[PDB]
Amino acid sequence: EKKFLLYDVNFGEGFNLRRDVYMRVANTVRSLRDSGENYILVLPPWGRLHHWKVALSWRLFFDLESLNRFIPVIEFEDFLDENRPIDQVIYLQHYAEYVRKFEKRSCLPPAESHYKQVEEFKWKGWFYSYEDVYSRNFQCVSIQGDSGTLKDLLKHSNFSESTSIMVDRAETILHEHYGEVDYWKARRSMRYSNDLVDVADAFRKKYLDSDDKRDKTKLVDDWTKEKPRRTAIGGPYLGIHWRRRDFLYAQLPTIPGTAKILQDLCKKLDLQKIYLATDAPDQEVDELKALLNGELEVYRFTDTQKLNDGQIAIIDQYLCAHAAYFIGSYESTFTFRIQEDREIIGFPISTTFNRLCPDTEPTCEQPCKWKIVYSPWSCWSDCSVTCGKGMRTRQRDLEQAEKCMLPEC
Amino acid sequence: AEKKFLLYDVNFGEGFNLRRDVYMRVANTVRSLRDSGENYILVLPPWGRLHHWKRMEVALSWRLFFDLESLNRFIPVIEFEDFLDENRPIDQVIYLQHYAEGWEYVRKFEKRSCLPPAESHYKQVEEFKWKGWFYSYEDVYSRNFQCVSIQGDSGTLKDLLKHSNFSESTSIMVDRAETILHEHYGEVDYWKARRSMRYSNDLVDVADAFRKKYLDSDDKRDKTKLVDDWTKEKPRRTAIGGPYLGIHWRRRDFLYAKKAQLPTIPGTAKILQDLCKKLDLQKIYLATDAPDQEVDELKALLNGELEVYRFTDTQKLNDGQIAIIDQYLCAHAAYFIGSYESTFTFRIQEDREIIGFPISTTFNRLCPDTEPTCEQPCKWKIVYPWSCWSDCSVTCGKGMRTRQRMLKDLEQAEKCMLPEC
Ligand SMILES: *[C@@H]1O[C@H](CO)[C@@H](O)[C@H](O)[C@H]1NC(C)=O
Ligand SMILES: *[C@@H]1O[C@H](CO)[C@@H](O)[C@H](O)[C@H]1NC(C)=O
């Protein structure tokens, strides 16, 4: 009666969107188990951070014991040690576009490039790069819905003989109860690897004169014992996430524009240290440094010898999340994860939900304050996706949805 | 007339046989460049995975698939790995894209802001250091990167490459090469480029042993002897082929069309049986990736006097080599019938043109069960009123077809929109 949910996401998606998808799928498993079904979530191995650069365990990035407190999880390679083929692949796809529904349908592009039947009950696919993994069955399902809709799909009678089901294009589903208790439980469960935390904490204490005791950012080991608070101070530094490439292809500051913002914030807050999270090339960083007043110092984690890119991103995000004040980039999922981290640490909202303005719009739109939780319309949710076709939703009809169209993956 | 190197790449998610077509576009660019006095040599991009549903492995040499000496007779070529051994940097990447305006149709190009998804594919790390896929090689970088909107052909790309902005670059890589169309589609230089793409002799030997053992077929009795040097090929339509029917049987419709363009399994059985009776053939060479149960079903439906053959000695050959063997075996049939709009089929048709088969035996497409008088492919004959529309420039995403006419509007173009890649 053990059942396994596997999943994957559109190949062109980034690390931080995938982290969001985890929570969608975790909540599906939570619902499944609350309805009496003994489902285990199989964690999909991580791949390349940059598309211009395989099979990495979650334990490199996240603390599995924390994830396990919300739902039972295992690594893909632990799933493989049960020597059971995958019974079913369901490839989610969109309806051409407020109505929750699903149906098995003919495969839209590009599903038939991704899976190939070689025998009656043998379908090949990428399967995270693992040779010798196959599925007994494959189909496409059009779906418009959330974790609850996916629960319903998974309990369909067509799969009642399947103990292992893989849901591809999992980013197709939305959150149920966006910004509410179960959303935040799923997010709170995603504690970073202790090894990453130790690395980041050594950097905080050495370079940023920052530690949990003086910063008032002590967190209990067990995230389920977290209590609400707004008393975090953080370290004596300004955290900035500085995105230079515009993945929406107007919305980002120039290099001088950024220097001005940083200088104003540093004066207003009496800060002399800046922790800069960026992949900007060295000459643009040097330009930015040269434009800053001489008493401000910029820091970056760059002792990255063994660390892969996802680990560095998490370190960057953890360092930003422990700043006294954070300012991030427009519509960036990297930024959104930092905002969530600061919510969990228990920082005042004013220090958290801040976005860099472009040079022409000094009072630009600032991000919605999705606050941790333990009518007029709500804010629109963040997009379900960072490239291609997705949706936002609004709640208070008591629920609404709209397309968000992003550039091609 | 210092040595210059042209590298290129193609949209990920384009397939092997479309890439073979793009080669010819870029080979003709090099041929034009060299005809205009520019000492360019073409660097052959390593091959990736044949299937998008397979584990990417090490980047593969062209010599596994093609005879490099034959390619070299049209233009000078080198393997990427050999280009690397010269410790020559990559000076410039030009990432081709469409005009953001879109569009009558004019040949033109212009440096422009990068359309999606160029920013994901190349990343500046230092002033003169751009990272990118570079065929999966880690230490390879470019000194410069830009996007160029372009509408045109091999000639337009030649012009772009001779622009003064690049005159200090010895090594230029052109990405999204499938963005350019053929110049003079279906004419002499098109066919020279195609004729140059002789298959690896090791693949030819394997295929010929199969022909002789199973298909009662060899070049002497088939009248399909080709001269070793393709530049000495003369026009002839004297090929008769082996005593077998060649069929390329696609099951997945990569156009995801609303109405079926492929026959069913019973539909295919009927077609094969009818053709075998009409042509008095008892042997069928089947080229397909269909799963084994669909093939067994097809076999079971065929009259007991028909024998179906497939190359299945596969376990020291990669998938591209097998596909080439399949194509070569189909190309030596007395009669060939292929699948709608399939680039695999189109390459076979071109093979048969080179071997010198009557056009009737070549330009045949399998009809779906509901349209027994379905549209048949244009007979683009080898060359040594408006034309037909060219085949699409791509197999996924946005491309173009063109149509041409001579004298005594010379050319026109239209968008063709395919499923996403
Ligand atoms: C279940 O199978 C039936 C029979 O093919 C099909 O009509 C139906 O759509 C399938 N439903 C799902 C969700 O698989
Ligand atoms: C040549 O270089 C200049 C430098 O910005 C640019 O404006 C121009 O468009 C370039 N031309 C081409 C076709 O690369």
Side-chain angles (χ1 to χ4, degrees), chain A residues 9-49:
Chain A
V9 168
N10 190 36
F11 290 124
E13 281 292 0
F15 187 71
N16 289 287
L17 194 286
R18 293 173 192 261
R19 286 168 60 175
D20 188 70
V21 175
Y22 172 76
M23 283 157 54
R24 301 177 204 168
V25 173
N27 274 114
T28 300
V29 168
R30 178 27 62 216
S31 299
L32 282 165
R33 291 181 68 73
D34 290 348
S35 89
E37 294 257 55
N38 188 22
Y39 258 93
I40 306 329
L41 181 63
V42 181
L43 298 178
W46 299 95
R48 41 150 71 164
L49 225 276

Side-chain angles (χ1 to χ4, degrees), chain B residues 109-111 146 148 160 163 165-166:
Chain B
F109 64 79
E110 174 174 343
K111 164 167 149 35
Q146 73 185 59
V148 172
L160 172 58
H163 184 114
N165 293 20
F166 311 124

Side-chain angles (χ1 to χ4, degrees), chain A residues 31-96:
Chain A
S31 299
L32 282 165
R33 291 181 68 73
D34 290 348
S35 89
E37 294 257 55
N38 188 22
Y39 258 93
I40 306 329
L41 181 63
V42 181
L43 298 178
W46 299 95
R48 41 150 71 164
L49 225 276
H50 297 70
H51 309 298
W52 51 262
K53 258 230 73 203
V54 280
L56 297 166
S57 315
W58 277 58
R59 64 164 179 267
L60 292 183
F61 304 99
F62 292 103
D63 182 63
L64 294 216
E65 173 189 40
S66 305
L67 291 171
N68 256 309
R69 291 177 199 291
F70 183 53
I71 52 166
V73 303
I74 65 166
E75 298 274 15
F76 183 61
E77 298 204 1
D78 308 325
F79 169 79
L80 285 182
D81 288 341
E82 316 214 12
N83 264 75
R84 36 163 91 256
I86 295 184
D87 294 309
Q88 183 71 235
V89 173
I90 300 166
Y91 193 102
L92 305 186
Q93 59 187 20
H94 291 286
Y95 289 99

